[PDB]
Amino acid sequence: NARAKRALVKREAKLVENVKQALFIPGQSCNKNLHDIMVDLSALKKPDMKRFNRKNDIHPFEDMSPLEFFSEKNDCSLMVLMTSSKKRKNNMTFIRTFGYKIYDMIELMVADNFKLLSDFKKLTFTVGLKPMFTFQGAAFDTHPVYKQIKSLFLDFFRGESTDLQDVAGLQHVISMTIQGDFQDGEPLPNVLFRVYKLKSYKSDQGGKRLPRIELVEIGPRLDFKIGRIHTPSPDMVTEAHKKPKQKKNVELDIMGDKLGRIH
Amino acid sequence: QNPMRDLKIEKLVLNISVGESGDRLTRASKVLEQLSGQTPVQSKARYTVRTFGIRRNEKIAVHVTVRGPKAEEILERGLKVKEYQLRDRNFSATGNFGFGIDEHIDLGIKYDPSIGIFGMDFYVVMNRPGARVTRRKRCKGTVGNSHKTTKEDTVSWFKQKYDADVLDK
Amino acid sequence: AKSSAYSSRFQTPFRRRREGKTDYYQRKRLVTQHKAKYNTPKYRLVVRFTNKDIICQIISSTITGDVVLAAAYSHELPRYGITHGLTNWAAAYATGLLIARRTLQKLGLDEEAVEDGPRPFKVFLDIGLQRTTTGARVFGALKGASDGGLYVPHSENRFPGWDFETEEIDPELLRSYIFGGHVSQYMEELADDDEERFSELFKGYLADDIDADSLEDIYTSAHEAIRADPAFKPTEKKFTKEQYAAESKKYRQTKLSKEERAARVAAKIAALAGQQ
Amino acid sequence: STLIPPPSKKQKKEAQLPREVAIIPKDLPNVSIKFQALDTGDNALRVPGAISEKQLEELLNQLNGTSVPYTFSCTIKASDPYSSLIKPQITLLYTPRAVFKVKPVTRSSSAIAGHGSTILCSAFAPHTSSRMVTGAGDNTARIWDCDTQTPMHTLKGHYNWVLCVSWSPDGEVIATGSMDNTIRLWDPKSGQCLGDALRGHSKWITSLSWEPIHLVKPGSKPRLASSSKDGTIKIWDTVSRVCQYTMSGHTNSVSCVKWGGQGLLYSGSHDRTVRVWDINSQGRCINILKSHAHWVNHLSLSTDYALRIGAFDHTGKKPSTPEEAQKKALENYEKICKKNGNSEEMMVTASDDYTMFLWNPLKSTKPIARMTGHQKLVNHVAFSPDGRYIVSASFDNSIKLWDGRDGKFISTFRGHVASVYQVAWSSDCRLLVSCSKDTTLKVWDVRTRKLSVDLPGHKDEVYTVDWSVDGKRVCSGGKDKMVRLWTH
Amino acid sequence: LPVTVEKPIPVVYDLGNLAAFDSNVLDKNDLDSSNARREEKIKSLTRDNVQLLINQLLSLPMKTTTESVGGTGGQSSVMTLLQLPDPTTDLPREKPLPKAKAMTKWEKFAAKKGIKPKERAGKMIYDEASGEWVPKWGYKGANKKLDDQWLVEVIDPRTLNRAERKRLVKKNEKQQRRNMKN
RNA sequence: GAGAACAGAAAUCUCCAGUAGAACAAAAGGGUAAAAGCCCCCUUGAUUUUGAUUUUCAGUGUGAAUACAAACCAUGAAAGU
RNA sequence: GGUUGCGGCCAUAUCUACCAGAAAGCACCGUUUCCCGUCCGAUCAACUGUAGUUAAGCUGGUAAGAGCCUGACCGAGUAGUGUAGUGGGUGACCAUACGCGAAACUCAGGUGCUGCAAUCU
Structure with a gap:
């Protein structure tokens, strides 16, 4: 009676939200190199994640209804579709939804010089912490495509929001870097995805407070090439970017004490 | 070969x-x-x-259900009542066997007119050592072909100790 | 008979799962500490009980498939001077008293940390696949760790000497099990009643000619010795890597070609087909 | 749960700005430094660039020529230890540590059941933290194995309650004071009655203090001293089992007794009077101290932590012979004793006039200073091990820190809700445990003058605590029957 | 060993999500895919930003509680967790805001005659004979005495009440559907 | 499907199978498999206290409903839920 | 390399029928006083490493096996289809062009890879 209520309570809307649940779908044309990169990318987004076994016939820019059909079933806003072709080799298509309706799409085609967690020297880690971030580029701020890519990966990989954070949790960092500066007119450069684990050292010139940080690679090394991009409608931005809504000459003091200025 | 893959009784299960x-x-x-x-x-x-x-x-x-010596006593004691003569059926393809008696007095035991008469179902289920594999909780497995109890191997076992006769085609 | 279509159709459970030892449902709950309230690293004392043997293991949690900080074992106890009763509860408690010292010793607090200080190492205990019951030897090992000063949250309950029909514990009954004096008492019973069974059981001890009352005192001494030298030592070994490999491959069967298989069929259709 | 109230709409936008960093700009201004000891000596002027406080040890150690590390302070207005110079020449105040770290006691081990009554007292062994005796309102005392959390010989003998207990500083003998009339000496290992019980006092026994080691001859056992409610004090010899001399100066009951440094008993009593008592005169009074308007509860000495342990320092590594034990007992004494190269033992008292007077009985029968502060009665007093801070427990739910040398007020510890019964120190002189009429015990960081950690556990009143000398372990005991042990 | 890192342009931070936005000018042929010495430049560039991200985080305020031993959903004493701010960075939300505000007919009426809605204490009504308390709705209801009990006074009386309950239960579950619609 | 006296088309016991012609509150579409199915043990719930909703005539430092959060309660060796 | 314990991927790891295993380690195995749970010491519980045994389990090998997976100008630039033309045709629907572009089918290869710690002629 009151089991599958609690499904619908979680799947209903909520002021302080849950984690956006990831869904990695193999498309029709998936292959073992991509199926690795899927899992290497998923291993960061653990736990809040699902994979299929099957190879599904989807064509995002032709027909959207299967993606909403999957999203509404599983209750998963973040979707990643895996396609491959001679035009678009290793095509990872990133999708987000807003109330089980399509918010945006962006196609990231993976370069041939990727490297996986098996390849690098294997080092200490914990399952499903908060990552740190670095975004190297002014284009991330200014340019709307790279604003959308900035809007993706933070929303993807952050996991749970929180007011309050441990030291020992701060183990690793995602690095996004755009491949050089560019002018409008030119081809759009690649986006380099690198993943580093930290190592502290006792620095002297800092002292007790500030350490020396030393990064070490673990991967997965990915280099993304931009494809077709479906942008949101300007009303749906106004809906999506909306606060929950939940004083003049009136201040709380310390001790509570609701004080009022006379003036 | 046989050292130790012998043919112990797992259990007797009496039923009314x-x-x-x-x-x-x-x-x-x-x-x-x-x-x-x-x-x-x-x-x-x-x-x-x-x-x-x-x-x-x-x-x-x-x-x-009864396991170990007490099992064998009541087995033989009831086995007596059946003249040490079962049938070519009676034994299962997976190497167990059973029989009945009517009248629960024909094997020790007094009568009591405030109790009446029943009879019983006897069923004797056989195994070797390492049947535990299909029965324990941890590393749970299935027993390999040339370790399984059979009709041939159990009848041969019965015909021997107990000395009893098989009967029928 | 199986329908070939069905054999395709069914989806296998997790390979490791399918194996009886390890359970995937339980793991999920241990996969995330909460993890919503805060971000914290996780350490777990994985305990399994193997025949003729005691094993205690402590495992980091990692998308690699994990790393071990400390390793505690029954064969260590002979080096600490206890040969006897590895399966027994008493012996398990010593392993707990010992594991904790080595990790502390390597960790270096006695004998990125900023804004203070030593910090208190908190390890959530592993279930294993073992059933939970009071006076379990699994929970004996937990109590051992507490002497070590490891914190898992626990009850006095699942120790022996826990009264069902009141929320109370006897420390004397728990004290006996640590020593293995209860097991020693059973030896006394065997000595007074029979000696057919006495020869069969504790036969090694009898070769030693140690006595049950004395064994309790001997057990007491061993606990003290563990604290003195908990660092651990590794055995020097006879024979290299390569020899062990070579001798093993004498009895390890080896692959074939398609070419060899092609002959075997051709050979087969020569024999078993063409009119005997 | 009434909350700490939330941050306002502006106070968020304060936090959202990037700010500060630790930095240290370079830092090299040439500011002049003076060096001063807290004992007496000033030692004269250097003028370096700015450096970390680990390095200012290495500047001192070569100058004095030691390798002794040192703790530092400055601005004595203020009193507070580049880390100084951000608050704006510097008079640097150096002082020795005794180098250590005893840990903050956080976790309970689970509650040890046993005897079915309230627990009245609870003393650790000096030499090891495994051994710990408890006296209950059940007629049994009990010795606990504390590593295994279980009873090592459940101990019987008496036919009333057992009010105070004490472990001898050599660590051979336990002594148990009683609500009847008797004392019973015990061996830890056997747990058996060493002869007949010591009988002599007419009413119940109030406290028991041992003759410390450095007085006693190498190859003789230490004598006991016992105060009782009739008001006499007797001095018990352990071998012969008979008192040498009764001492009967006090009219009313004696609240506690202590055996001092230089052959000198002190006895805090209910006739408002503190009697300094020489051993060599064979039962005779020398000086009689009068301040208090009420009776005197408890009497702490500067040496008392050293006299209680007697030779066994924190490792507990034993003396090989009595002639070694003489020297080890003398050396632990002479760590604290020679402060200015002179054996100035401080004595301090508590009483229901809400006041502690500070005494130096060899030098003057006058008092030095009047520590006055509390509202309701003070109950326990304690010097810190190094004789540097005093602290006293009170019935107004608050523990006041007083400087040991001049009896000057420092600070107050606030946190306890109901009345505080007794306190004890960590050996390194940093942490400080306290027990209350409510459930909770708390531990107090003396350096920052603050609550380090609250620890709840018990179901009822908690009378007794003690800290183990090594400083792994803390005991407790009270009205709910269950002995709880506490650790890191 | 040197910790602090100058740049030409100031770094724009987001300590809610833990991010460091860097607008300083990158070289092409450093990060071109033909380059042998490519990756160490990305490591060198990132290590600066991560250092600058940490050197903020350690200068935040931190919670330092005195509670210990089973703080049943929180931190121990000798942790010391760092008080982060909120996100500056505006995400898009997962779902639209939970506001399906209907009045539903009763509450319209309950405005016009108020009917301040009630103190709402609990289940247990008092029985007289029995002496004991006993609810109401819950268990052994003051609803279902008449069904269980043994004589009635003044065609069956009980099953009329079993009807006349289920009429009112139907009526509530009907009167939902109009207010669910509107 | 293969066996056991009375015992039969249907009485209970025993062995091997249904990737689920298990029943998962529901409706489907997926996957849980040492389960959410079946069986046993342990137990309140319409809790109390404060910022957003709205309603009062003693505007009742909120009096009570409602939205959320926090202490608490239940259970378990705990992880937790 | 073998083996135990923990696993990551989660069928190249499973399923069906046979075959082999030196060492150690798993394992089966013996016993019911103690704590514990059962209709039943079979499960679970404890005690011993003794009386025995590689017979299973486990790990490899075997087979034009049953499945699954990868690769391809094998099928195929095929169907599907955006866009363009006052293209065709009575309609149903289908060529031309500028762009993307599947799956069965058919042939070829493979039959688990690997993180951490201890221990073996």
Whole structure:
């Protein structure tokens, strides 16, 4: 009676939200190199994640209804579709939804010089912490495509929001870097995805407070090439970017004490 | 070859189904109790039947399982009653076997006119060492082909110790 | 008979799962500490009980498939001077008293940390696949760790000597099990009643000619010795890597070619077909 | 749960700005430094660039020529230890540590059941933290194995309650004071009655203090001293089992007794009077101290932590012979004793006039200073091990820190809700445990003058605590019957 | 060993999500895919930003509680967790805001005659004979005495009440559907 | 499907199978498999206290409903839920 | 390399029928006083490493096996289809062009890879 209520309570809307649940779908044309990169990318987004076994016939820019059909079933806003072709080799298509309706799409085609967690020297880690971030580029701020890519990966990989954070949790960092500066007119450069684990050292010139940080690679090394991009409608931005809504000459003091200025 | 893959008895399971529930049920229970030392168990009816006059969950039948020496005693003691003569059936393809007797007095045991007569189902289930594999919780497995109990191997075992006769085609 | 279509159809459980030792449902709950309230690293004392043997293991949690900080074992106890009763509860408690010292010793607090200080190492205990019951030897090992000063949250309950029909514990009964004096008492019973069974059981001890009352005192001494030298030592070994490999491959069957298989069929259709 | 109230709409936008960093700009201004000891000596002027406080040890150690590390302070207005110079020449105040770290005691081990009554007292062994005796309102005392959390010989003998207990500083003998009339000496290992019980006092026994080691001859056992409610004090010899001399100066009951440094008993009593008592005169009074308007509860000495342990320092590594034990007992004494190269033992008292007077009985029968502060009665007093801070427990739910040398007020510890019964120190002189009429015990960081960690556990009143000398372990005991042990 | 990192342009931070936005000018042929010495430049560039991200985080305020031993959903004493701010960075939300505000007919009426909605204490009504308390709705209801009990006074009386309950239960579950619609 | 006296088309016991013609509150579409199915043990719930909703005539430092959060309660060896 | 314990991927790891295993380690195995749970020491519980045994489990090998997976100008630039033309045709629907572009089918290869710690002629 009151089991599958609690499904619908979680799947209903909520002021302080849950984690956006990831869904990695193999498309029709998936292959073992991509199926690795899927899992290497998923291993960061653990736990809040699902994979299929099957190879599904989807064509995002032709027909959207299967993606909403999957999203509404599983209750998963973040979707990643895996396609491959001679035009678009290793095509990872990133999708987000807003109330089980399509918010945006962006196609990231993976370069041939990727490297996986098996390849690098294997080092200490914990399952499903908060990552740190670095975004190297002014284009991330200014340019709307790279604003959308900035809007993706933070929303993807952050996991749970929180007011309050441990030291020992701060183990690793995602690095996004755009491949050089560019002018409008030119081809759009690649986006380099690198993943580093930290190592502290006792620095002297800092002292007790500030350490020396030393990064070490673990991967997965990915280099993304931009494809077709479906942008949101300007009303749906106004809906999506909306606060929950939940004083003049009136201040709380310390001790509570609701004080009022006379003036 | 055989060292130690011998042919021990897993268990004897005695059973008395009762058409009715009441005195005559709890008395059948009492028979299995004093015979086994152990308290017996009351199976319920699985559905309502009508031509048997029984309803779902009625409590219909008692039984008891017995393992190690006491098993073999009651086996042989009942085995006597059947003249040391079973049948070519009676043995299962997976190498167990069973028989019945009517009248629970034909194997020790007095009568008591405030108790009545029942008879019994005897069923003797056989194994080798390492049957545990298909029975323990941890590393649970299935037993390989040339370790499984068979009809041939159990009948041969029966024909030997006990000395009894098989009968039939 | 199986329908070939069905054999395709069914989806296998997790390979490791399918194996009886390890359970995937339980793991999920241990996969995330909460993890919503805060971000914290996780340490777990994985305990399994193997025949003729005691094993205690402590495992980091990692998308690699994990790393071990400390390793505690029954064969260590002979080095600490206890040969006897590895399966026994008493012996398990010593493993707990010992594991904790080595990790502390390597960790270096006695004998990125900023804004203070030593910090208290908190390890959530592993279930294993073992059933939970009071006076379990699994929970004996937990109590051992507490002497070590490891914190898992626990009850006095699942120790032996726990009264069901009141929320109370006897420390004397728990004290006996640590020593293995209860097991020693059973030896006394065997000495007074029979000696057919006495020869069969504790036969090694009898070769030693140690006595049950004395064994309790001997057990007491061993606990003290563990604290003195908990660092651990590794055995020097006879025979290299390569030899062990070579001798093993004498009895390890080896692959074939398609070419060899092609002959075997051709050979087969020569024999078993063409009119005998 | 009434909350700490939330941050306002502006106070968020304060936090959202990037700010500060630790930095240290370079830092090299040439500011002049003076060096001063807290004992007496000033030692004269250097003028370096700015450096970390680990390095200012290495500047001192070569100058004095030691390798002794040192703790530092400055601005004595203020009193507070580049880390100084951000608050704006510097008079640097150096002082020795005794180098250590005893840990903050956080976790309970689970509650040890046993005897079915309230627990009245609870003393650790000096030499090891495994051994710990408890005296209950059940007629049994009990010795606990504390590593295994279980009873090592459940101990019987008496036919009333057992009010105080004490472990001898050599660590051979336990002594148990009683609500009847008797004392019973015990061996830890056997747990058996060493002869007949010591009988002599007419009413119940109030406290028991041992003759410390450095007085006693190498190859003789230490004598006991016992105060009782009739008001006499007797001095018990352990071998012969008979008192040498009764001492009967006090009219009313004696609240506690202590055996001092230089052959000198001190006895805090209910006739408002503190009697300094020489051993060599064979039962005779020398000086009689009068301040208090009420009776005197408890009497702490500067040496008392050293006299209690007697030779066994924190490792507990034993003396090989009595002639070694003489020297080890003398050396632990002479760590604290020679402060200015002179054996100035401080004595301090508590009483229901809400006041502690500070005494130096060899030098003057006058008092030095009047520590006055509390509202309701003070109950326990304690010097810190190094004789540097004093602290006293009170019935107004608050523990006041007083400087040991001049009896000057420092600070107050606030946190306890109901009345505080007794306190004890960590050996390194940093942490400080306290027990209350409510459930909770708390531990107090003396350096920052603050609550380090609250620890709840018990179901009822908690009378007794003690800290183990090594400083792994803390005991407790009270009205709910269950002995709880506490650790890191 | 040197910790602090100058740049030409100031770094724009987000300590809610833990991010460091860097607008300083990158070289092409450093990060071109033909380059042998490519990756160490990305490591060198990132290590600066991560250092600058940490050197903020350690200068935040931190919670330092005195509670210990089973703080049943929180931190121990000798942790010390760092008080982060909120996100500056505006995400898009997962779902639209939970506001399906209907009045539903009763509450319209309950405005016009108020009917301040009630103090709402609990289940247990008092029985007289029995002496004991006994609810109401819950268990052994003051609803279902008449069904169980043994004589009635003044066609069956009980099953009329079993009807006349289920009329009112139907009526509530009907009167939902109009207010669910509107 | 293969066996066991009375015992039969349906009485209970025993061995091997249904990737689920298990029943998962529901409706489907997926996957849980040492389960959410069946059986046993342990137990309140319409809790109390404060910022957003709205309603009062003693505007009742909120009096009570409602939205959320926090202490608490239940259970378990705990992880937790 | 073998083996135990923990695993990551989660069928190249499973399923069916046979075959082999030196060492150690798993394992089966013996016993019911103690704590514990059962209709039943079979499960679970404890005690011993003794009396025995590689017979299973486990790990490899075997087979034009049953499945699954990868690769391809094998099928195929095929169907599907955006866009363009006052293209065709009575309609149903289908060529031309500028762009993307599947799956069965058919042939070829493979039959688990690997993180951490201890221990073996």
